[PDB]
Design a protein around this nucleic acid. Structure first.
Lengths: 112, 218, 101, 135, 51
RNA sequence: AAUUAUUUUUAUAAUAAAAAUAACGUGCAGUAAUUAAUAUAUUUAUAAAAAUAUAUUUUUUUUUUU
RNA sequence: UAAAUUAUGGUCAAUUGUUAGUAUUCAUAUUAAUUUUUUUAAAUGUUUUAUCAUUUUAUAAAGGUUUAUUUUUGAAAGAUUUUUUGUAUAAAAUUUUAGGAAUAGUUAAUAAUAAUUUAUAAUUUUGAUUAGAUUGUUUUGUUAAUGCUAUUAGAUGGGUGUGGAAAAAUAAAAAAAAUAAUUAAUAUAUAUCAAUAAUAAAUUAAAGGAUGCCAGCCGUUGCGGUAAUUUCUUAAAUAUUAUACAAUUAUCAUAUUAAAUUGUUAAGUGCUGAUUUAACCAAUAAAAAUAUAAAUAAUUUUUAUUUGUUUUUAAACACCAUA
């Protein structure tokens, strides 16, 4: 149980209006439940959020759940460009070990 | 019930007990009966496995578990291999047969202490100085005692029909210890039990800590 | 008191009690606030402590060290959070302000 | 000094809950009862509720509690409260079963009273040896 | 608060275990059997391994 | 010229909103030359009233005193 | 009816402040206040593994309503071993309601796991069932007070049958199988951005207002009187009643008995009460244990007044004009 301060009046039960997770997923491009009934030729805008876009979700963005034959659309992803450091092998230490660098997509914006 | 009358009832009970001890005056030497067992143990129910059929601590051994038995020796014709070959020799088995047992029962008992895989393998018959014994004759009717030379002549049949359905340790109490590797008369029955673990008390009752004021007894 | 409490009867008066209960409540139960004798030991070792079991401490000329009471302003509660008081569990709790002074 | 049993209880609470003994809860809260039904049409057939009903098992007034000093505790030592009782066989309509009416005592400090209550128990007699009226 | 408070000398001059009063603890016969068997098993526990 | 301390009603093969009421009897109240009091019940439209029936009670000395 | 015995031959006291503990202010305390502060904006990195898998990681909230419980040995602790044998399931006892009554997948017995059976079953006026309120809770507050008052430890039969155990959709962190780190106030927000609102959730430091009124010889010309004048500039609730003086809602209700009541089959009388403090006969006066014993009692009755019953139906008398 959780503490609750007693009150001689009636208690209000708010149900709330949060931002729909479905909308956040749709704009982020990571909605795997949406089925568009009609295929169209019009650019689709998606805003990358904390590197939540990946090959898995982008494949569905290319081939929507409605059942498609081709990536017949333009796909704008605001942000989402990554930069990859070079990789090199540390021979020192206990043994040979790769260091792959990494992708600073969300961590380094394009313009401050 | 009103407790105030307890003293008066105590006086009345004292006087009644004195009148009883004084008037009838018919005590006497009466055989005590075995106390049997009770179904009303306290606590929660017990499972089938542990229903050993005694629910109290009885430190005595009553008559029904006590048996009158005689230590008979049964001789066997065995052959040993000496440098020449197959010298005849004699083998004995200790049997504790009840005084009232029949010769067939004694034979069946001997079947049960024959741990040796070589001794009791073919059908045999018991005999006294050659004279075969009637398998439905009581020991007392033959007069056999422990100082009685009795032999087991093994007829060269095979496939001796056995029934291990009767546990080697079967008393009226109907205990069934799974291990039948030794007879009850041979088992010491008092030895340290390693198949267990001693457990200390890890649940404090009332006292848990810094100061033992009263110990929260109960 | 019930399960954990050692108290067996009300402090001062109770309903009528009978037999061993009356005997215990009247005489035999532990009375820990007694100022003349402490609770009484079993039979073989009460006799040999009979002459140690009187009074509280043999000196009746005790010179009170320590702080003097404050009579104005009179405080109601002395409860402060403390870091090194190992007797705080007892320093808490209402107690009767009745003593020699 | 000598401490109460309240000090021992507070020590136990502090040890188990880590210093959590109380909260100094507000005591003078002004409650109000709001009537919903009609003046003489409460929806029940036996007890009608029109005030603030407090729902304490040991927190109702006038105070009452078990009184462990009665005939049973007076007449034989018990391994545990209520383990051994003395009563009167009241009904034997069930096979191998006796209904025994037993009494105990409740204590009311406010009135310094010792009122005797009654309780009914299904007992077991396998050989049908108990007749109504047996102690 | 009770800064200077003392106790009887019986408390400091009592021997050890003088205060224990003899009370007869009562328990069911089933409890007696259970506890006696448990104590016998604990006594008979074989040493060497952990005992 | 003396003595006086809240509730009611209502709906259709459509199913709660409309109405009304309430708030001690108490105004310009009851025939005062003035008509025994008190209780309980029955009746009558003068009803905050009256009548009838029963019961009790009210005496200030010259009837009675276990 | 015991009758006043002569040693008065021993006086010279008390106080030295040293304690066997509920103590009472009807108005001071006690609360929301005179002194109330302080912050809080969600969107989230547990881990190791043989790798599309497997091993370790069992009580978040709101809602719904709450008996008064719980040592799965079974996992771990944990060892010279070995069991999923190391007795966890039970009981006693304490609840509320201004208009107080019925309850039921029902009780016991059983060669019945998994009840085709048998019984005069079971709960309840000693207050049940349902409904309403509703976690419990010597911890709070108050008092001279066995009085009043207050409260948050928890728990959770259809979401996987997995697991030793469902406690499983959230996690101020109890360190989680290599010493990650171990003299640090960190227990950080600083896991800093992002739709979103202070509605809401938590917490008590001591590094000048009110406020109008009026016929102008009279059309809806919209003049004035008028810069209109008066009311506004510690208390309420109270704990402590733990007692009810008192009577005009009272809140209801044991029948007042040997001097009394009843009489048909029993007495007496025109209804015994005009006279008279007195009334023949029959029935009826006591009769278990126990005074401490905390139910030791019954649940019925009506002598008074009205009203019915009916009432060729009282003759009357008195009321009406039946009773």
């Amino acid at each position: 149980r959780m503490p609750r301060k007693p009150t001689p009046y009636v208690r209000k039960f708010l149900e709330g209006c949060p931002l729909p997770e479905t909308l956040v997923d749709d704009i982020a491009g990571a909605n795997l439940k949406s089925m568009a009934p009609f295929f169209t030729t019009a650019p689709r805008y998606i805003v990358a959020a904390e590197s939540r876009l990946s090959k898995l979700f982008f494949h569905h963005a290319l081939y929507p759940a409605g059942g498609a034959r081709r990536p017949c659309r333009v796909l704008i992803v605001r942000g989402g460009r990554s930069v990859r450091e070079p990789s090199f092998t540390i021979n020192t230490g206990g043994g040979r070990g790769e260091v792959g660098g990494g992708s600073r997509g969300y961590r380094d914006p394009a313009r401050r | 019930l009103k407790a105030g009358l307890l003293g008066h009832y105590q006086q009345e009970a004292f006087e009644a007990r004195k009148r009883f001890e004084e008037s009838t005056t018919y005590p006497g030497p009466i055989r005590a009966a075995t106390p049997g067992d009770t179904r009303f143990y306290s606590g929660s129910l017990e499972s089938i496995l542990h229903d050993t059929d005694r629910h109290y601590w009885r430190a005595v051994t009553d008559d029904p578990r006590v048996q009158h038995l005689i230590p008979l020796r049964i001789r066997f014709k065995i052959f040993t291999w000496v440098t020449s070959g197959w010298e005849q020799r004699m083998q004995v088995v200790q049997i504790m047969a009840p005084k009232d047992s029949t010769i067939a029962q004694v034979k069946d008992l001997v079947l049960v202490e024959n741990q040796s895989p070589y001794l009791c393998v073919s059908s045999f018959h018991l005999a006294i100085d050659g004279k075969e014994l009637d398998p439905q004759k009581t020991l007392g009717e033959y007069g056999v005692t422990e100082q009685s030379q009795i032999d087991a002549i093994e007829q060269n049949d095979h496939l001796l029909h056995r029934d291990d359905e009767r546990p080697r340790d079967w008393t009226v109490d109907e205990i069934t210890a799974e291990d039948v590797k030794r007879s009850p008369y041979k088992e010491m029955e008092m030895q340290p039990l390693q198949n267990l673990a001693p457990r200390y008390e890890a649940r404090p009752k009332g006292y848990f800590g810094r100061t033992y004021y009263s110990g929260m007894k109960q | 008191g019930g399960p954990g409490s050692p108290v067996r009867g009300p402090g001062y008066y109770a309903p009528p009690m009978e037999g061993e209960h009356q005997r215990g409540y009247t005489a035999e139960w532990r009375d820990l606030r007694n100022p003349m004798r402490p609770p009484e030991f079993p039979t073989p070792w009460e006799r040999k402590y009979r002459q140690y079991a009187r009074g509280q401490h043999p000196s009746y000329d005790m010179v009170y060290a320590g702080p003097m009471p404050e009579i104005f302003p009179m405080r109601r509660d002395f409860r402060k959070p403390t870091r090194w008081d190992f007797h705080d569990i007892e320093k808490q709790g209402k107690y009767r302000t009745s003593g020699p002074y | 000094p000598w401490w109460n049993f309240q000090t021992e209880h507070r020590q136990r609470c502090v040890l188990m809950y880590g210093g959590a003994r109380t909260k100094n809860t507000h005591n003078a809260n002004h409650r109000v009862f709001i009537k919903k039904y009609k003046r003489n049409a409460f929806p029940n057939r036996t007890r009608h509720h029109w005030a603030v009903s407090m729902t304490g098992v040991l927190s109702q007034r006038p105070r009452r509690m078990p009184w462990p000093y009665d005939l049973t505790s007076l007449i034989f030592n018990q391994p545990r409260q209520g383990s051994d009782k003395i009563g009167y066989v009241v009904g034997t309509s069930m096979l191998k079963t006796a209904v025994v009416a037993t009494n105990h005592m409740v204590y009311y400090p406010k009135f310094n009273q010792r009122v005797s209550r009654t309780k009914r128990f299904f007992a077991h007699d396998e050989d049908l040896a108990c007749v109504e009226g047996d102690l | 608060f009770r800064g200077a408070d003392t106790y009887s000398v019986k408390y400091c001059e009592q021997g050890r275990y003088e205060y224990q009063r003899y009370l007869m603890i009562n328990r069911f016969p089933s409890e007696y059997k259970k506890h006696f068997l448990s104590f016998l098993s604990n006594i008979r526990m074989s040493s060497g391994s952990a005992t």
